[PDB]
């Protein structure tokens, strides 16, 4: 049910990235493809999504007509080519299963490219808790949002984030219940009880119900009391 990406490019400004995503697992066909990238020591940023529809191609308010998306039903391999590549463009780009109206339930290790309206979410910082204890974390939309469409992930530095909440209050694959899902409009939560030594990573929000941008918070870290 996992994916598997090609390999790290070393481009040049100017010219244009190709970066590949075969998969194996359930019927490629009927399920949507996206691309998200990660700026170094930035958020995620969500370019465009994919079906077989291949008219389906869409992509956010910025990156459009920069970014091209791909895809081929018989081999199973969708693709992502970024044109005019610059300094800012530097940043592990990730492929994942689903984007409108479907949370990223798995999720690609991530190719590294190196170069050389809105729905805004908004997180709440920095936050250094010990294990045993209750962790409270907050997420505020610029506009009310359905529910249907709010969902967490957790991400351990060196890897791809991990669906925890889908559906603003539904527990993900794997998922225990000492994580515990959001509700409304605007003030969405994630509450992490009995706290333990490998829930400590940094937590995401998402925004996945309309708005062409298809949105991220910024970020909470969360760490362990103490230096």
């Known amino acids: 049910v996992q994916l598997v990406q090609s390999g790290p490019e070393v481009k040049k400004p100017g010219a244009s990235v190709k970066v590949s995503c075969k998969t194996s697992g359930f019927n490629f066909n009927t399920y949507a493809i996206t691309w998200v990238r990660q700026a170094p020591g930035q958020g995620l940023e969500y370019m465009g999504w994919?079906?077989?529809?291949?008219?389906?191609?869409s992509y956010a308010w910025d990156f459009k007509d920069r970014v091209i998306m791909t895809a081929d039903k018989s081999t199973t391999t969708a693709y992502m080519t970024l044109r005019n590549l610059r300094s800012d463009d530097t940043a592990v780009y990730y492929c994942?299963?689903?984007?409108?109206?479907?949370?990223?339930?798995?999720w690609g290790k991530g190719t590294l490219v190196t170069v050389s309206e809105t729905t805004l979410t908004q997180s709440p910082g920095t936050l250094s808790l010990s294990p045993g204890e209750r962790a409270t974390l907050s997420c505020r939309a610029s506009?009310?949002?359905?529910?249907?469409?709010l969902a967490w992930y957790q991400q351990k530095p060196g890897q791809a984030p991990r669906l925890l909440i889908y559906?603003?209050?539904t527990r993900a694959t794997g998922i225990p219940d000492r994580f515990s899902g959001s509700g409304s409009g605007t003030d969405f939560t994630l509450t992490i009880s009995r706290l333990e030594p490998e829930d400590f990573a940094v937590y995401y929000c998402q925004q996945y119900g309309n708005s062409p941008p298809n949105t991220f918070g910024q970020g909470t870290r969360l760490e362990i009391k103490r230096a």
């Open positions: 994919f079906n077989v529809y291949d008219g389906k191609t």
């Open positions: 506009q009310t949002v359905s529910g249907s469409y």
């Open positions: 994942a299963r689903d984007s409108w109206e479907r949370f990223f339930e798995h």
């Open positions: 559906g603003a209050s």
